[PDB]
Amino acid sequence: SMNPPPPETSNPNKPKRQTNQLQYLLRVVLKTLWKHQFAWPFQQPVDAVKLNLPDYYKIIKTPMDMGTIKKRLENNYYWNAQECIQDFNTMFTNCYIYNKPGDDIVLMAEALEKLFLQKINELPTEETE
Ligand SMILES: *C[C@@H](O)c1ccc(Cn2cc(-c3c(C)noc3C)ccc2=O)cc1
């Protein structure tokens, strides 16, 4: 079995920006989630080879994880905060699609998504450079 290449965290041609909102995503939102006791399964791409999940990447065609998001924010990969928010949403969605509702990993993801949504209500209202 093989894993796919992970999602890119840098791209030489993609315009880069640091916005007030992107800075709040790094300094607050991701800080809270990264350090939470439920974060660790989500800190790196799903390793389908080590987990013995040969169907994972047959079912999940848009992978995403918090390690990728952290590297994207540190590399100033994004133009806007909505791209980052979309990545968190993808990560949660993937967990809910692959696993059975009420598996422990799903309940953990639900708890992190609830926390995520709480924190992103405190984003600066207007995105500015
Ligand atoms: C929340 C905690 O109880 C727990 C449960 C299960 C695992 C096992 N596991 C699962 C994954 C995984 C992800 C992130 N998405 O689909 C799966 C199957 C990854 C690593 C891992 O050890 C960990 C913690």
From Swiss-Prot:
PTM field: Phosphorylation by CK2 disrupt the intramolecular binding between the bromo domain 2 and the NPS region and promotes binding between the NPS and the BID regions, leading to activate the protein and promote binding to acetylated histones. In absence of phosphorylation, BRD4 does not localize to p53/TP53 target gene promoters, phosphorylation promoting recruitment to p53/TP53 target promoters.
Residue stretches spanning the membrane: none
Domain Bromo positions: 17-123
Subcellular localization, as worded in the UniProt entry: Nucleus; Chromosome
Chain coiled-coil ranges: none
Tissue note: Ubiquitously expressed.
Cross-link Glycyl lysine isopeptide (Lys-Gly) (interchain with G-Cter in SUMO2), sequence positions: K58
Signal sequence bounds: none
Effect of N99A: Abolishes binding to acetylated histones
Site (Acetylated histone binding): N99
Subunit structure, interactors included: Interacts with p53/TP53; the interaction is direct. Interacts (via CTD region) with CDK9 and CCNT1, acting as an associated component of P-TEFb complex. Interacts with RELA (when acetylated at 'Lys-310'). Interacts (via NET domain) with NSD3, CHD4, BICRA and ATAD5. The interaction with BICRA bridges BRD4 to the GBAF complex. Interacts (via NET domain) with JMJD6 (via JmjC and N-terminal domains); the interaction is stronger in presence of ssRNA and recruits JMJD6 on distal enhancers. Interacts with NSD3. Interacts with NIPBL.
Record: disease: Cornelia de Lange syndrome 6: A form of Cornelia de Lange syndrome, a clinically heterogeneous developmental disorder associated with malformations affecting multiple systems. It is characterized by facial dysmorphisms, abnormal hands and feet, growth delay, cognitive retardation, hirsutism, gastroesophageal dysfunction and cardiac, ophthalmologic and genitourinary anomalies. CDLS6 inheritance is autosomal dominant.
Domain comment, as recorded: The NET domain mediates interaction with a number of chromatin proteins involved in transcription regulation (NSD3, JMJD6, CHD4, GLTSCR1 and ATAD5). The C-terminal (CTD) region mediates interaction and recruitment of CDK9 and CCNT1 subunits of the P-TEFb complex. It is also required for maintenance of higher-order chromatin structure.
Family membership: Belongs to the BET family.
Primary role: Chromatin reader protein that recognizes and binds acetylated histones and plays a key role in transmission of epigenetic memory across cell divisions and transcription regulation. Remains associated with acetylated chromatin throughout the entire cell cycle and provides epigenetic memory for postmitotic G1 gene transcription by preserving acetylated chromatin status and maintaining high-order chromatin structure. During interphase, plays a key role in regulating the transcription of signal-inducible genes by associating with the P-TEFb complex and recruiting it to promoters.
Note: JQ1, a thieno-triazolo-1,4-diazepine derivative, and I-BET, a benzodiazepine derivative, have been tested on tumors with success. Treatment with GSK1210151A (I-BET151, a I-BET derivative) has strong effets on mixed lineage leukemia and promotes myeloid differentiation and leukemia stem-cell depletion.
Protein name: Bromodomain-containing protein 4
Part of the full-length chain shown: 42 to 170 of 1362
